[PDB]
Design an enzyme around this catalytic site. Structure first.
Site, PDB file in Angstrom:
ATOM      1  CE  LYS A   4     -10.596  -5.927 -15.195  1.00  0.00           C
ATOM      2  NZ  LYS A   4     -12.190  -6.099 -14.451  1.00  0.00           N
ATOM      3  CE1 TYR A  58       6.916   3.684  -8.302  1.00  0.00           C
ATOM      4  CE2 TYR A  58       6.530   1.758  -9.977  1.00  0.00           C
ATOM      5  CZ  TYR A  58       6.233   2.362  -8.453  1.00  0.00           C
ATOM      6  OH  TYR A  58       5.868   1.723  -7.519  1.00  0.00           O
TER       7      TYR A  58
END
Lengths: 147, 147, 147, 147
Positions: free
Chosen positions: C1, C58
Site C-alpha cells: 500500500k 494520468y
DNA sequence: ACCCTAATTCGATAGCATATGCTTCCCGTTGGGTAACATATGCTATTGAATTAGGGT
DNA sequence: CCTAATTCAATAGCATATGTTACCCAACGGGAAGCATATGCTATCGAATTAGG
C-alpha cells in the site's frame, strides 16, 4: 425478488442505470447541433438497433427513451435467420433467431444519422456484450403513420 | 379448440389458407422479372407492413413467407403512438399502441418496391379490415446483418 | 500500500486498468484507417491534453501509452493562468495553476486529429472529472527533435 | 549556500540577471510592432522551446517572462526519446530523457512567429550550451483554454 | 330490376407454449483518489569556467 | 604572440511537483427472478361479400 410492480407495458419509468446510459448518449449526440422535430411531424426516418444481447439492447432503449422524447420506440422483438452458408435449402423466411432488435422512430433524416453515430460510439467503448450492438439508419420511403 | 400443436415460433407450415394468400402475391410478382438475391447476400432494403389488424397482418405475414422464399420476416410487434393532436402532454417514447407491424428483409432494393406494390395491390382486393394495411419501403443505409 | 516498486520515471508498466482504458481508445481510433508513421520519422504533430484532474489525465496518458506505441509522451506538468477578468494587471507569465496537461508526439497531422476526436469522444461519456479533460491538436511548424 | 527562499513555484521575481536576458529580447522584437493580445483572450499559438540545457533553458523561461507580460509560460519538464536508429527495439512511449522543454502560450499567430525569431537570434549571441536551444512555432487548432 | 336464400371467404378465436416488458437484488468491471518511496522542478544566492576587454610590448 | 575583467551556466538545498505502484471503494451496467401480458401456432367457428332453376 421480482414480481409485479403495477406499471404495465410501454409504461416504463426512470432508474439510475438508464439515466446514465441516457446522459452518456445526450453527450455524444451533442457534438452535432441539428433539428429533432419537423413542422410537419411525419415519421420518415428511423434507426435500427440490434445485436449484443437482450439485456444490453434493452437498457440502451431505456436510456434512449430518456435522451430523446422526440422519438417513438418499438419494443424489442427478434430477427429472422440469415442466409445459410453452403448451397443447400435456405432457412424458412419466418424462422426466429435469439438476437433482438428495436426500432427508433424519428421525424428527421439528419438527426437519425446523429443518433446512429452516437449509439455506435456510446457502445464501442463498453465491454461485452454491449460492443456487439449494431446500428443502421433506415429511412421510410412513404412515411410511417404512427397512431 | 386451441392448444399446443407442436410448432414453435417461426416454424409454421403451410395450409390452404396461407398458400392462397401467397398465390395471390405470386401472380402479382410473376409479372415482375426482377432479381431477388444478390451475391454479396447483404440485406439492404425492407418492406415495413403495419396497421390493419393483428390477425390479417398475421395471415399476410404467413402468406408472404410462402410466396417469397427469398425474404426474411420478423415476428409481429407493436407500434408506439405518434404525436398527439390538440394539446396536452405528448406520448412517452416507449408507450405502445394496439397497432401491429412486421418487417420483410430483402437483398435488393428493386424487389422491395416491387413487393411493396404486390402487397399494396393484393391487400386492396381482400375484404376489410385487411385493406387498411399499409406498406412502406425501408432502406438500410448500412444494411441489416441477419444472424 | 505505497512505497518503492522499482519503476523510475518514464518507465511505467502495464496493469488491467490502463489496458482497458487503452482498449476503449483503440476502438474510437479504428474508425479511420489512416497511417501512423512516415519514413522521415519527423515529429510534426501532437495532441495537447489537459484539465479534469491529475489522476484522470494520468490514467489517460497511461492508456494512450499502450494504445499508441508510435507516439511519444511527455510527463504531466501544470498550466499557467489565463486572462484575469477586468482591467487590472494580469497574472505573472510564470505563475502556474493546478490544472495539469501532457502531450503526445506524432509523425502525421492526419492521425493527430483522429486522436483528438478519439479522446474527445472517449471522455464525454464518462462521469467527472474524466469528461472535463480537454483536447486540442498541435502542429509544430519546424518539427520537434526528440532526442 | 542554497535552501528555501520563500518563493513557491511560478512566483519567481526579477533580478538583474534575468532582466539582462529580457532586454535582449525586448531589443530584437522592439522594432517589430505587431499585436501580442486579442480581446477574445484566446490562446491559439505556442512557441515550443527545448534542448539547450536544463539551466540555460531555465534562465530563458525567466527572461522571456519579464520581456513579455503578454505571454504565458509552462514550467520546465522533460521530452521523451525519439527514434532509435535501426530496427532495434524502440523506446517506450512514456520513455523520458535528460532533455528539457517549456512552452510559450500566446494570443496571436503573428507574434508567435516573431517571438520564435527573437529567441532564435537572442540565443545565437550567447555562448554554448545556450546556442543549442531549439525553438519551433506551435499552433493549436482548437486553442488552449488556460485556467 | 327484384330478392330471399345457398355456398363462399377470411378474419376472429380459443388455448398451450413461450416471448418481452417491468422492476428489484446481485455482482463482476470500470476507473478515479490516495499512501509512500525515488526523484523530478521552482526558487535564490554563491560559485566556476569559458569568452571578452585591456594594455603593456 | 600578451594576464585582469566579464559573462552566464552550473550548484547547493529547502519545499514541493509528479512517476510509479497497490489498496480502497463509489459507480456503471449486464444478468436473473418473477408477475402481467403480449405473440406463434393450429383448427374451428362466425360474420361479412358473392352467387343461381
Amino acid at each position: 425478488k421480482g414480481g409485479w410492480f403495477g406499471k404495465h407495458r410501454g409504461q416504463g419509468g426512470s432508474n439510475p442505470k438508464f439515466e446514465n446510459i441516457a446522459e452518456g448518449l445526450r453527450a455524444l449526440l451533442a457534438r452535432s447541433h441539428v433539428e429533432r422535430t419537423t413542422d410537419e411531424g411525419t415519421w420518415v426516418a428511423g434507426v435500427f438497433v440490434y445485436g449484443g444481447s437482450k439485456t444490453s439492447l434493452y437498457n440502451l432503449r431505456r436510456g434512449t427513451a430518456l435522451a430523446i422524447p422526440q422519438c417513438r420506440l418499438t419494443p424489442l422483438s427478434r430477427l429472422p435467420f440469415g442466409m445459410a452458408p453452403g448451397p443447400g435449402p435456405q432457412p424458412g423466411p419466418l424462422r426466429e433467431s435469439i438476437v433482438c432488435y428495436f426500432m427508433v422512430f424519428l421525424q428527421t433524416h439528419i438527426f437519425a444519422e446523429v443518433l446512429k453515430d452516437a449509439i455506435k460510439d456510446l457502445v464501442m467503448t463498453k465491454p461485452a456484450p454491449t460492443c456487439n450492438i449494431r446500428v443502421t439508419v433506415c429511412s421510410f420511403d412513404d412515411g410511417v403513420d404512427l397512431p
